[PDB]
């Protein structure tokens, strides 16, 4: 980010900013959360009311991840809805405009399925991250008791060293210590392995979806060129338009290329 | 989509589905709109209450586009918020886990700025699409009057052909016809040109953002490999971890590569 | 269909639409089901009230197929009835008009027999499709019991593993499993074979009937040319008409050609 060498949140100029000026900001910027309900805050605050202390930190993230998933679902649904209106608007216009509108409308409506698949994979990653919390919360109580029965024996030794409970308390401490050692080792093992596996799974899906979206956008941009936007003075008639044999071929080729693409066919080559 | 050769919304198997089984669906699917308020429906329904008939179809799309923008903003904000919790969770863990968590946390927090830039460019595209509606709504009333003063002269000719208003009404019809012809030609010219320009502008931003996101995801996946997830039995100590000189270099290289990338350096090559 | 590349149900222009403008829509379009009775819905809803779950899906289609057959029968009956009125109307007119009306009336009345034969063949295809449902509904109960006596043994093993019923329950499971395996294999075999045979039988009849109808229509169109429609001013007498020797020959030739046609004499050659 730009904060890593500046005291202000303003963004330093980049290659894109040098080539083209930064886009103007939004006309309206309301100073509101935009959630529209108390459900988000209630769910965020109710997680730690009764849960164990050790697993609270990770358990808090699951709720906000679910909120992210819901917001992405709403975004995808609304973007899918917009394509229908864009398509129907083209009925009362020229034939070329109507045809281009319909084809680009299905092309842009394609996005919703990719968004839904990405949402499902995000849900699986969230499920694994949730699965970590179960082992953490199971580990905590075994550690608590061993610590408590240590203060117990310390206090009882302070009160009087002639009590016969010293040896049994010490042996209970030894057994609890062995169990806690085993639990503590496996906890680190499991958290490392699960974090690595889940996070690799989550990182593959996003790049796959991004590459598919980029391919769809490129195909749409290639298709848009066929409009033949030329100025005409009043009193003239533009020639009849015939581009169905090109538009249909473009749509079929785009669908086939999107379907054929596989994981090993990734065009992006990071440096 | 899969609807183009099937009667059911189910998706036909693809290369990705053949390689890996489809992800399991979400655990909960509530049968609700999810908007959380009547504002969306109210804004959608109030657009056509008083506006001209010709521009209503295009004016209806602006509101849903604004809703899409707001939902995307909420998604970006929540995803940005999640990274902070992910980062703070790593404090109470092993040193390697904490370091990897912090670095990948900033790497995944990077996404919000790209989302905001895409939102701004989307807003500019929406502004141009709005600008089309002004010319449409200005064109409509000029066309309405010429049609009305035609039924007027027709009715007055039917009533009695000896009235002296025939010639003045006919000439007013001629003048209104000339003005309507000019307006009708320019309307088509302007709508074609503006649609092409705005839609090219909108299609470039999405592919740029997708390529940047894919690069960030690839760099993060490359960074994640350094975890060295190996199983350890209880009673052993893992060697001290030293990977700061690699993690910091990876972060710096990723930031430099993201900054250096330009429009002409697009790796994606559509067929 | 036209939905396979468009978001709207509107039909894209075709060769026929390019050659001739699309026909105007019907004058009246009532927003009603048109069934005229609750019998259709009652029969559709009563099929699954008590039947087995596996065969319900296929059993639901038989009722709607019977409804299709009844509607086709009503259509054929009404079309047959219309020819009688068309023929009787020609009595009070010119001799040539009366003769042409009678001959084309029998030619168009011919259609009803072909429709009845197609209906009978449709009924046979429906009978075979019904015959599939019997085997499906016989297969289901054999599968249900094997599954149930599995949950039974699982629960009884959970309750106490020292019961002596484990071995007898397990052997009953084994025998039911073998029977279910045999039934499951034969079910797939039978459904595939019956579907293929019935659907070939159903597809042959429709093309035969369509070819016969096309031949009849072509012969009628050829016969209609003999009317000699020419304009006449008042005060003149048209020459006496003599075309019985041509009309009777045309009717006889049409009947002979329709009778002689066989399956191997199909003129249609799909690409
Ligand atoms: O049906 P409700 O009223 O919505 O409540 C759900 C229920 O408490 C589940 O046990 C819980 O799963 P977990 O115990 O695994 O957390 C889920 O949270 P989740 O969807 O975030 O998993 C809750 O939404
Ligand atoms: O300030 P408010 O109460 O929110 O009302 C705004 C105001 O009516 C603007 O004129 C209008 O811009 P337009 O006339 O150009 O539509 C805008 O719509 P918009 O944001 O969709 O442009 C509205 O949100
Ligand atoms: O005589 P009704 O009162 O009309 O009732 C008939 C009777 O129940 C038949 O057994 C049944 O054949 P199936 O058992 O084979 O279904 C037929 O359905 P069908 O004509 O669709 O075969 C029914 O119409």
Residue numbers in the entry:
A (entry chain B), B (entry chain A), C (entry chain L): 1 to 271
Task: Please give sentences taken from the publication describing this entry.
The yeast eisosome, composed of the BAR-domain proteins Pil1 and Lsp1 (hereafter, Pil1/Lsp1), scaffolds a membrane compartment that senses and responds to mechanical stress by flattening and releasing sequestered factors. MCC–eisosomes are relatively stable, and have been implicated in sensing and responding to plasma membrane stress: various stimuli, including hypo-osmotic shock, heat shock and mechanical pressure, cause eisosomes to flatten and release sequestered proteins to affect signalling or transport functions. Here we isolated near-native eisosomes as helical tubules made up of a lattice of Pil1/Lsp1 bound to plasma membrane lipids, and solved their structures by helical reconstruction.
Our final reconstructions were made with three lipid mixtures: (1) ‘minus PI(4,5)P2/plus sterol’ (‘−PI(4,5)P2/+sterol’), containing 30% cholesterol; (2) ‘plus PI(4,5)P2/minus sterol’ (‘+PI(4,5)P2/−sterol’), containing 10% PI(4,5)P2; and (3) ‘plus PI(4,5)P2/plus sterol’ (‘+PI(4,5)P2/+sterol’), containing 10% PI(4,5)P2 and 15% cholesterol. For all three lipid mixtures, the overall architecture of the Pil1 lattice is similar to the native-source samples. In the +PI(4,5)P2/−sterol samples, the AH density is improved, and the AH density resolution is best and most resembles that of the native-source eisosomes in the +PI(4,5)P2/+sterol samples, which suggests that PI(4,5)P2 is crucial for AH stabilization. One feature that was notably absent from the +PI(4,5)P2/−sterol helices was the pattern of membrane voids in the cytoplasmic leaflet that we observe in the native-source eisosome filaments. Notably, these conserved residues were previously shown to be important for eisosome assembly in vivo and membrane binding in vitro. This extra density, not present in the −PI(4,5)P2/+sterol Pil1 filaments, is likely to reflect a PI(4,5)P2-binding site in the native-source eisosomes. In addition, in the CG MD simulations for both the +PI(4,5)P2/−sterol and the +PI(4,5)P2/+sterol systems, PI(4,5)P2 occupancy was increased at charged residues in the lipid-binding pocket, especially residues R43, Q60, R126, K130 and R133.
